[PDB]
Curated annotation (Swiss-Prot):
N-glycosylated. Belongs to the jacalin lectin family. It comes from Homo sapiens. The chain holds residues 18 to 150 of 172 of the full protein. It comes from the Eukaryota. Keywords: Cell membrane, Cytoplasm, Glycoprotein, Lectin, Membrane, Secreted, Signal. This is Pancreatic adenocarcinoma up-regulated factor. GO terms for biological process: cell migration. The gene is ZG16B.
Length: 133
């Protein structure tokens, strides 16, 4: 469920039937992952987290799901790696701090949301919602 030292303002991505995560954007400053943003179908969901940084955009091909995520913390979320069902990885930031593994406890489940806590400087805490397409 919830990774990091935490404390902050709670966020969670919009979770929808009829619409899945088709893409994603993570904002990274010089060091910290500031904010995340999922595209749900043909529309970017609200952008959640600290302001600022450079935003990496990543686009899932149809039928491609996020199935696992590594996350590194250091007072603030430094880095995140997402692996998909098409043998594709997406690196954001640098994996340095305390690495942690998020995966579904069940088979064929895939990333449906992201949630956590953030403050002014970036994200203090992150977690992932798994579920069938």
């Amino acid at each position: 469920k919830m990774y990091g030292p935490g404390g902050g303002k709670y966020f969670s991505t919009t979770e929808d039937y009829d619409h899945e995560i088709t893409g994603l954007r993570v904002s990274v400053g010089l060091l910290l992952v500031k904010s995340v943003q999922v595209k749900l179908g043909d529309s970017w969901d609200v952008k959640l987290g600290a302001l600022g940084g450079n935003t990496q955009e990543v686009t899932l091909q149809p039928g491609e799901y996020i199935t696992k995520v590594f996350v590194a913390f250091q007072a603030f979320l430094r880095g995140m790696v997402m692996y998909t069902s098409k043998d594709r990885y997406f690196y954001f930031g640098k994996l340095d701090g305390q690495i942690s593994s998020a995966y579904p406890s069940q088979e064929g489940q895939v990333l449906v949301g992201i949630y956590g806590q953030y403050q002014l400087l970036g994200i203090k805490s992150i977690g992932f919602e798994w579920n069938y397409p």
